[PDB]
Paper text:
[name] adopts the canonical ɑ/β-hydrolase fold, in which the strictly conserved catalytic triad S131-H208-D177, as predicted from sequence alignment with homologous enzymes that exhibit [name]-hydrolytic activity, is found on the protein surface.
The recombinant protein of wild-type [name] without signal peptide was expressed and crystallized in the orthorhombic space group P212121. The strictly conserved DS2 (C244-C260) connects the C-terminal helix and the last loop, while the [name]-specific DS1 (C174-C210) links two loops that harbor the catalytic acid and base. Among the surrounding amino acids a distinct S185 is found in [name], which is consistently replaced by a His in the homologous enzymes. Further analyses indicate that a His side chain would be too close to allow “A” or “B” conformer of W156 in [name], while a Ser residue can yield a space to accommodate the “C” conformer of W156.
Residue numbers in the entry: -1 to 261
The structure:
């Protein structure tokens, strides 16, 4: 049956691995950030309908630059994306989560503000969370606390606690094989194994350092394909993307692939 959220032409591996999707992207800096430090909004000009929104948070000491590449990559496939700086560079995961949710809230405000470039462009019922390291831990906290979120795709997550057993939101964990800041054995993998209630996926990048999914990474084709496919499948209920979302990509750039409850 027709999916009112489907946007864009039918996907291929090549179209998803490309540096950009079908839609023209513009961006702006949020003038008066509400509940977080600073933000940049990326949006499609010509998506053909309202789109979901995704809020992305950096790691400790880090800024938007570390996660910026997701903004154009996701927006060009039909999402509104807000990348944030935190109130302090030394904010911890819980605070990062609150700020992430504040950023989504502001996206909803701007959707209703006629002066904004994103006026009327957002479906405020359909949201997702992403982020690096402690910002990835924050993303998981956001999902735990707000199960109406449609998707979560943290990268190299870290939190003091690895128990996210309550999470019912579809969650893709990007992991970095050689991470020594948040080692996979003590962070990303126990987090992944804790979650028994959801669609989930574990994608570990072969030879990756802790920054393996950050801006400038050497795996933007694969990582971008997977992120976009996960968000399309789960934020847009778009079953054109189910295979790309759920499949083992059979890539030598991947040292560990796992998934559950994905169809």
């Amino acid at each position: 049956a027709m999916n009112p959220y489907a946007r864009g032409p039918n996907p291929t591996a090549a179209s998803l691995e490309a540096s950009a999707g079908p839609f023209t992207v513009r961006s702006f800096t949020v003038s008066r950030p509400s509940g977080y430090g600073a933000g940049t909004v990326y949006y499609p000009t010509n998506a053909g309908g309202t789109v979901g929104a995704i809020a992305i948070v950096p790691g400790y000491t880090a800024r938007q630059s570390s996660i910026k590449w997701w903004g154009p990559r996701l927006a060009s496939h039909g999402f509104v994306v807000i990348t944030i700086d935190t109130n302090s560079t030394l904010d911890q995961p819980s605070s990062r989560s609150s700020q992430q949710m504040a950023a989504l809230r502001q996206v909803a405000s701007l959707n209703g503000t006629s002066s904004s470039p994103i006026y009327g462009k957002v479906d405020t019922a359909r949201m997702g969370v992403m982020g690096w390291s402690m910002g990835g831990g924050g993303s998981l906290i956001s999902a735990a606390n707000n199960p109406s979120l449609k998707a979560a795709a943290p990268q190299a997550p870290w939190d003091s606690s690895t128990n996210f057993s309550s999470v019912t939101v579809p969650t893709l964990i990007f992991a970095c094989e050689n991470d020594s800041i948040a080692p996979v054995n003590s962070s990303a993998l126990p987090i992944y194994d804790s979650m028994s209630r959801n669609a989930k996926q574990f994608l570990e990048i072969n030879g990756g350092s802790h920054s393996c999914a950050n801006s400038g990474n050497s795996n933007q084709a694969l990582i971008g394909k997977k992120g976009v496919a996960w968000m399309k499948r789960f934020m847009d209920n778009d079953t054109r993307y189910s295979t790309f979302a759920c499949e083992n990509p059979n890539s030598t750039r991947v040292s560990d692939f796992r998934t559950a409850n994905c169809s």
